[PDB]
Design a protein around this nucleic acid. Sequence first.
DNA 1: ATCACCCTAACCCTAACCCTAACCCTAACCCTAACCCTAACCCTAACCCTAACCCTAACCCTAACCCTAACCCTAACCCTAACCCTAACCCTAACCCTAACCCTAACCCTAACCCTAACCCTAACCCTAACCCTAACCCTAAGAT
DNA 2: ATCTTAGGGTTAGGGTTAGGGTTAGGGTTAGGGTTAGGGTTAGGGTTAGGGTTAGGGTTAGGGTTAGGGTTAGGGTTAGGGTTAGGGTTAGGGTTAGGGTTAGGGTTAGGGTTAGGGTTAGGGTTAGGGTTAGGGTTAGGGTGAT
Lengths: 94, 95, 105, 103, 95, 96, 87, 78
Amino acid sequence: RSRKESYSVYVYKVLKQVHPDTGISSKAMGIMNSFVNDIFERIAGEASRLAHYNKRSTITSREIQTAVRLLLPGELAKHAVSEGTKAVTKYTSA
Amino acid sequence: RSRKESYSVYVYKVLKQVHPDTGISSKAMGIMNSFVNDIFERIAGEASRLAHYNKRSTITSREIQTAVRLLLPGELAKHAVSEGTKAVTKYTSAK
Amino acid sequence: AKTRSSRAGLQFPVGRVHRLLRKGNYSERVGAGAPVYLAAVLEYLTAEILELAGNAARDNKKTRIIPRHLQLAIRNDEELNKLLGRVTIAQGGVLPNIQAVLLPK
Amino acid sequence: TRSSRAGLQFPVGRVHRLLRKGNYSERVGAGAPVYLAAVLEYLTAEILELAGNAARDNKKTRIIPRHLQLAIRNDEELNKLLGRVTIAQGGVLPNIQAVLLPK
Amino acid sequence: RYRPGTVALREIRRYQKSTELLIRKLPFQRLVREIAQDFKTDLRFQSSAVMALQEACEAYLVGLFEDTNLCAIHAKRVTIMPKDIQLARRIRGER
Amino acid sequence: RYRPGTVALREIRRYQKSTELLIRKLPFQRLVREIAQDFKTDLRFQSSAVMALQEACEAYLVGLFEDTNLCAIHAKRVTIMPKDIQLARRIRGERA
Amino acid sequence: KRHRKVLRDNIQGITKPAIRRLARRGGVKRISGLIYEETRGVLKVFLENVIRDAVTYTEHAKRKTVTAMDVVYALKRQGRTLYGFGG
Amino acid sequence: NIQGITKPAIRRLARRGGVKRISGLIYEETRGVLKVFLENVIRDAVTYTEHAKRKTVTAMDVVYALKRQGRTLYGFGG
DNA sequence: ATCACCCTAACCCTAACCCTAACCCTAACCCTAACCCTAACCCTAACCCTAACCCTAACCCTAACCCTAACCCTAACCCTAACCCTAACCCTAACCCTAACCCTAACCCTAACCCTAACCCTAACCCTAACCCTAACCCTAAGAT
DNA sequence: ATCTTAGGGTTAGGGTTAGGGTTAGGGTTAGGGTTAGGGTTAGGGTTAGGGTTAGGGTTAGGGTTAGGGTTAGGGTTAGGGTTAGGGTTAGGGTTAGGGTTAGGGTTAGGGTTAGGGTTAGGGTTAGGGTTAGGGTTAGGGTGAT
Ligand SMILES: [Mn+2]
Ligand SMILES: [Mn+2]
Ligand SMILES: [Mn+2]
Ligand SMILES: [Mn+2]
């Protein structure tokens, strides 16, 4: 056999923080896994293009940030760009 | 300054083949350059995905093959798959 | 903290995302903060969805979120609907809407 | 030249370099740039053909973007392939709905 | 006996409010195997792949009905006609 | 004096069989620079970038008129109305 | 171990009641009689376009079995991205 | 400047689109729809300019924004 | 406008089946050390844009009229919804068996690594035809006798 | 149709700019050879998909009455179209300033490579809770009296 990757462990963790009584179906977890994978490649691909356009060999968090600003709306983008720079800042501290 | 790449040399050569008694404007050459670049990316990207889906680390002419089948129409796709395998075959003959 | 996710205050895997960015052919090199920023953007969006879905599950008297609750959450938001506009949630159904002209006199 | 070895006008060497530089995959096969330069050359020839013929019917020798648009939108396959594309300075195909025609 | 458009309105709410598939699994599985074999023979279909196709189809058709209905309402009607399906697909870029 | 819809049909043929831009370059360049100031101040525009924007706009609007007209004809009309532009954009996936 | 059976006319398997249900979910009150065939035509086109690419993926993968992923990749190509069957 | 896109300039674009009769309400609705289109394109074009650390919005930035919007433009160095 | 009956909705609990919380083991993430080429400075060339003048002249704009499209209502069939019953065939959980996928073992060559060499194509300059820009024409229907 | 009316396509002449034919040399592709691993071999497990039995009850097909949505008529109103002349404003025409973009030189450091280490998370088995499905429950609004 072969091992199969999944964001299920994290979708469960994040579900408990938000609704600690609320559970998730196997099909709904599949829909959540498809959502994470789609948005991962949407952002990664846009950042891959940004790095290319500006003759740069690397994808830094600056490429991720402008990719977010291009793909998601200001409100959702505004809060994701916030939540993002925050985690980056905290990572640089430790 | 900086060097600017272009498919103009080749669009001229190929134009000479179909219509030697015909020319091309600077704007129309830009439209042809945008066309080649778009289709280049379209095929290359689809082949990049095919290689990836099948856990392969190389884009071979087989990936270009199926990308063209997916991207181009049955007719245009039929003639592109033909001219493609043809040029590959001819290249294998001559070293 | 030993995991990169713990250093950043994230639930989403910073280490895994960094591996997928390299193993996905997006660029020659991947910055140190790019998987951290990305795992955070993905974690935010999943929390944002899970929130509205748990709310739709609680309205339907259910304990567990099924794909119907996910669809209801997506299409009832303006931004989630726009973001997932050309996406199809399997087993999601449609939002209940009957045009006013089709209503009885 | 690798293009001469394949009977092509399009640059086999350049296409091979753009495939590895463009971040499409770890490695690029020997025949992939050859097949690709050929598909690009074919499509260019297919367009140039119908565009030259459009200039032939408008008393011109040089192909302008109008001739390119006329060639694209008059074909069924070129129109479908370039369906979500806009040719700058191309204009539209002349078509007036039958209902808008005089009584 | 219910008036014309009373069971119709009950049906709309009954189905919009649910998620179950609206085409039977076997007639649809035959149609899938027919289309796919007519095109490439000796083919096998994963149980899931057929369901992925069925979900896609129904979701598409329901969305097509949505736009079609908006076209009937646009031309002061309540019943969907082929000229509405055609207009919806024309504007959708399916032609 | 021409009948209603005789100079209109002449205009359609005049413009369809033509490629020149139908919006004056300066009113358009002002609108572009105005809209840009809302996203970022101290902005410069390449001559070509403005033209790229103008071509894109007109090509879009002409295509939008095409679908709009088909909506007017669908509801037994000859004149385009806002409810036709709205129906075109809604089914195009720009509206709802 | 021998041979299969002939597959023919299965577009009629997408019955008039099955088409009615899809119209109801789409919020349709009155359904013309001509619709039932026009829908069958349009469904056939959709299925052809999706299965053609799905099978093109299967053939590239050197497989005889069209997987859920092939149908998923085919849908993303058609711009009808589907959530829930992997990917 | 939104009024600079005049009623006669809008009528020419309707003629190219094959339009015989043009309602009076149209001229305003078109102005609204053009403003939305321009906002969406320039917003992304400028987002590209800002990422490039530039003050001048290039033809390429407008091209990349159009490709993002699915309104791909041929001829401006794309 | 008052009653009768058909519907969803909602109670009951019994009902299976799916979720999740246990288990443990397998692999992917983490640490750490040399490792180099990208990207960071630095300055500064040379670009291209904006600012601000001019002269009409193509084009925008208000208001001159009536043409006919949109709109409404009314009334013409006739198309499509609603009801019923019959027997299919879809669904059901089984049954199997092998073709079809794929693990994982072994080895070869296909690809990438370096450089230096010819060789193609960019960036330039220049001229000259192709197309532009004007006038006066035939052709062609446009509107009304 | 047959009468005058517009106008836009038609030829022809002589203007202006840009295809595209030229130049040299920068930098790209190409052909030497070394080296490592990805993909091609053969294989066996082993899943999983196709087809086979088996039953029944949901769900479909097909003709019924007639209800009302579709589309026909003409007739009311005025919305946009045409024509026009007053006149704003866009369009080249052609100057210079200097912030902007960025070429290219130094220096550092961030991201890559490396294998042993270890934790998370993939797969697994398993009880009980949420959901499922079959029973009546009144309320509810539909649609004839
Ligand atoms: Mn009625
Ligand atoms: Mn008026
Ligand atoms: Mn480091
Ligand atoms: Mn697990």
